[PDB]
Paper text:
The TMEM175 channel was found to mediate a major K+ permeability of lysosomes and late endosomes (hence also named KEL), and is not related to canonical K+ channels. The vertebrate TMEM175 proteins are composed of two homologous non-identical repeats, each comprising six transmembrane domains forming dimers; the bacterial homologues consist of only one such repeat and form tetramers. We obtained a crystal structure at a resolution of 2.4 Å of a TMEM175 channel from Marivirga tractuosa (MtTMEM175) and in combination with functional analysis, propose how selectivity for K+ ions is achieved. Each MtTMEM175 subunit is composed of six transmembrane helices which assemble to form a tetrameric channel as verified using SEC-MALLS of uncomplexed MtTMEM175.
In crystal soaking experiments with the T38A mutant of MtTMEM175 we could not detect anomalous signal for Zn, even when using concentrations of 2.5 mM (0.5–2.5 mM tested) and contouring of the anomalous signal at 4σ and 2σ. This supports an attraction for Zn2+ ions in the pore in close distance to, or directly at the selectivity filter and indicates that the T38A mutation changes the electrostatic environment in the pore. Indeed, the T38A mutant of MtTMEM175 retained its sensitivity for Zn2+; in WT and the mutant channel Zn2+ caused at a reference voltage of −60 mV the same relative inhibition (WT 66.9 ± 12%, T38A mutant 69.7 ± 10 n = 4). This suggests that the bacterial channel is inhibited by Zn2+ through a different mechanism, that is not a pore block. However, our functional analysis does not support the idea that Zn2+ is blocking MtTMEM175 by the same mechanism as hTMEM175.
Residue numbers in the entry:
A (entry chain A): 244 to 282, 302 to 483
B (entry chain D): 123 to 243
C (entry chain B): 9 to 238
D (entry chain E): 9 to 230
The structure:
């Protein structure tokens, strides 16, 4: 239920030839919940913990989406951090999985960023009216979203008609739990420069180049 | 050609499977048709044109066909007659003459979704 | 068949905790009645039939607890140490309050018997009805009722803590959360009598009247909580 | 195995209501016998052996109720609030008439013992057999029997009210309807004795004598 009790659990699991937690450390969207758990002083706390996990050999230095996914699906790691989309691949494997609340850090919850999957029409497209037809009458329909969802889960769909089906799923409940503890990302143009600043900062601190204090300095600029 | 007129909400595919066994034992074709408004298309077409050989509908429409002279008198032997419930034969009787063969009793019921409504009104 | 159509009943199969529990509920209601003496004469027979009103009230009260137990174990099918622990605490409280309920039920049946005018038999058999004793009566039974509902709240909270392990859906999470609130709200009424009696604002029977009158105000607060969820 | 070959038994799996109920039936028949004192001398033993005829009568009577309970829960597999409520009322009635029956069975076992000539012990042990006492006796065990068959009728009516939810077929609907009638007809005999004893037409033992006789003609009066 807490981030701070993972090192103990990892010591226990490493004795039996298993990891505790493996997730994508390269993409900052996955590391941000821990970083933003308290908050600055909050970012310094959250990241130092993440740095200590790699320093204590609990997590690998270059842990990416593929080796984390594969390791969990194979049955090598006891935990992983991922989205709705990842569930179908677990179902394919023979792993009795559970989706739950993200661990708390410094008592407070880990605040994961909330994304709204959205479809936009390219300004330089001649098929603007044909795309509107596809999006409205064919995709954003009960039948349409069902087709996408049975391939790889969408999460909590925006369609009002899908509330009953969403509510029947325990994994959706866990997703909504984390979404309430997190916050929706502002759409602002500066988000790109922000994400890049966090992507470098996390990689530098993970590998062992820049210090945790120097990472937030270069990132705030 | 043996042509049968029965409503589209009924089991015409199954009625055809009976018709397919008939052709195997005799050689006569048994096509099953389901046209719209057959209850009011039959007395117009069957009077003038050929229409169907056998007409399937609830017994209530048959008295009008019988008065107009659009139906042959049914003459089934005792042994066949005895296979069906005597009350069913009464429904297919107009002025002391059997005007059809009774198949089944039909009545509307309340169909409900047990998941959305376990104790219905 | 069940309470909620959206709830998936994990405990349809009978378990040891439930079998043991059933014996104890049966043992409780059964020994409440059958703890009485066997009539040996017509006089005893008529005396023993005066006990059915008190027993009906007790039995009604115990099955209401049994029902809540049945519904909990039906909902979650739990069987872990902590559930066993909380379950034992419950049965323990039940058991210690079986004979005291027989007592209270007989006592109140005489008091209400006198009021309506059915009977006119003595209450001196119960042993001095003093302010201190009538206060301890509330505090005792009030502490009992509070504990039962407190334990039911803890049991539902244990299921809430294992929501992911139990694969609880949004409807089931909501039910569980509502069941905790329901049991804490149920517990609040005896907690409020008990506190009022222990402080004793009036220093006389008035205290006991108010404390007893709060049980009559369960119905309205229960309706508020039921209305809020609908 | 079962009563009807056309009935589909919904309650083959044991449930909590049935497990609880089984304890209470067992607790009843078991405490009826084991409520007695433990013999500490041969004198106390030979006395408890006189008690077996009344116990046999009582036990036979309680299993007959248990059987009807077993068949109902086997037929419908019901487990709802109203079924729980009616089931509790039943077990409550049972429980109240356990020790009373231990007494009536002993009372009749003494009277009928005297008649046949097996024993010659006193009936003053039972403390005044006045008209009002022997009247109240028939009003008591008559009110008990009536209320047990009345409850069984209500339980079958609850299943009849849920016929569609239970997916009851024409044979099962008929059985359910017949079971309601059976239990109301069973309840009618004690309801008659009770009404006879209460109205008291003769004003003497002629009333009580009849009230006991209506049970002996259970099948014919049905
Ligand atoms: C409302 C109307 C009903 C009022 C009922 C009040 C009953 O009150 C209660 O009666 C029973 C009569 O058996 C007494 O009970 C007494 O007899 C029973 C008879 O088996 C013995 O088991 C017991 O040892 C003895 O206490 C209680 O001590 C008395 O408190
Ligand atoms: C037919 C012939 C047989 C007649 C049997 C009638 C039984 O008669 C019955 O005997 C028993 C003797 O145990 C008496 O019962 C007595 O003995 C038992 C001994 O354990 C005590 O527990 C019981 O509480 C006490 O009342 C009844 O008060 C009397 O009514
Ligand atoms: O990693 C930073 C990256 O995170 C978010 O992207 C998510 C995307 O939203 C998810 O759907 C998922 O596929 O993973 C991506 C990260 O791997 C932000 O949306 C994006 O702007 C940002 O670059």
């Amino acid at each position: 239920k807490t981030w701070e009790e993972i090192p103990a659990l990892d010591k226990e699991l490493k004795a039996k030839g298993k990891s505790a937690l493996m997730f994508n450390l390269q993409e900052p969207y996955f590391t941000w919940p821990l970083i933003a758990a308290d908050g600055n002083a909050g970012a310094k706390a959250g990241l130092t913990f993440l740095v200590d996990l790699i320093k204590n050999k609990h997590m690998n230095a270059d842990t990416d989406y593929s080796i984390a996914e594969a390791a969990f699906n194979k049955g090598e790691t006891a935990m992983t951090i991922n989205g709705p989309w990842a569930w179908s691949n677990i179902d394919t494997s023979k792993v009795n999985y559970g989706v739950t609340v993200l661990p708390t850090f410094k008592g407070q919850p880990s605040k994961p960023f909330v994304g709204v999957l959205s479809a936009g029409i390219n300004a330089a497209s001649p098929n603007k009216e044909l795309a509107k037809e596809f999006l409205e009458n064919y995709l954003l329909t009960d039948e349409g979203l069902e087709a996408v969802n049975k391939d790889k889960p969408l999460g909590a769909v925006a369609l009002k008609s899908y509330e009953e089906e969403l509510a029947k799923d325990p994994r959706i409940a866990a997703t909504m739990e984390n979404a309430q503890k997190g916050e929706i990302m502002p759409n602002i143009p500066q988000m790109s420069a922000f994400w890049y600043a966090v992507r470098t900062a996390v990689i530098n601190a993970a590998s062992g180049r820049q210090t945790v204090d120097e990472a937030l300095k270069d990132a705030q600029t | 050609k043996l042509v049968i007129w029965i409503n589209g909400d009924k089991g015409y595919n199954g009625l055809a499977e009976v018709g397919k066994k008939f052709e195997k034992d005799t050689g006569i074709k048994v096509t099953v048709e389901h046209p719209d408004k057959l209850e009011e298309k039959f007395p117009q077409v069957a009077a003038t044109g050929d229409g169907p050989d056998i007409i399937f509908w609830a017994h209530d429409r048959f008295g009008g066909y019988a008065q107009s002279g659009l139906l042959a008198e049914i003459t089934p032997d005792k042994a066949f007659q005895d296979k069906l419930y005597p009350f069913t034969w009464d429904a297919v009787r107009y002025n002391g003459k059997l005007i059809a063969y009774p198949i089944a009793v039909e009545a509307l019921s309340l169909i409900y979704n047990k998941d959305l409504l376990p104790n219905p009104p | 068949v069940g309470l909620n159509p959206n709830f998936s009943f994990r405990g349809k199969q009978q378990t040891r905790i439930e079998t043991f529990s059933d014996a104890v509920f049966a043992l409780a209601i059964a020994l409440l009645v059958l703890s009485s003496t066997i009539p040996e004469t017509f006089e005893d027979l008529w005396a023993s039939m005066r006990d059915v009103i008190p027993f009906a009230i007790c039995v009604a009260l115990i099955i209401v607890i049994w029902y809540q137990h049945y519904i909990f174990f039906l909902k979650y099918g739990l069987q872990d140490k902590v559930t066993i622990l909380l379950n034992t605490i419950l049965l323990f409280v039940l058991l210690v309050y079986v004979y005291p309920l027989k007592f209270l039920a007989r006592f109140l049946s005489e008091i209400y018997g006198g009021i309506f005018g059915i009977i006119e038999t003595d209450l001196s058999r119960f042993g001095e009805y003093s302010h201190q004793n009538l206060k301890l009566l509330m505090v005792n039974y009030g502490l009992g009722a509070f504990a039962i509902f407190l334990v039911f709240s803890l049991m539902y909270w244990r299921a809430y803590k294992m929501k992911s392990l139990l694969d609880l859906n949004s409807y089931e999470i909501f039910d569980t959360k509502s069941s905790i609130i329901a049991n804490l709200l149920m517990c609040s009424v005896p907690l409020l009598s008990l506190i009022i009696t222990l402080i004793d604002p009036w220093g006389n029977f008035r205290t006991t009247i108010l404390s007893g009158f709060l049980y009559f105000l369960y119905v309205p607060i229960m309706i508020v909580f039921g209305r809020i969820t609908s």
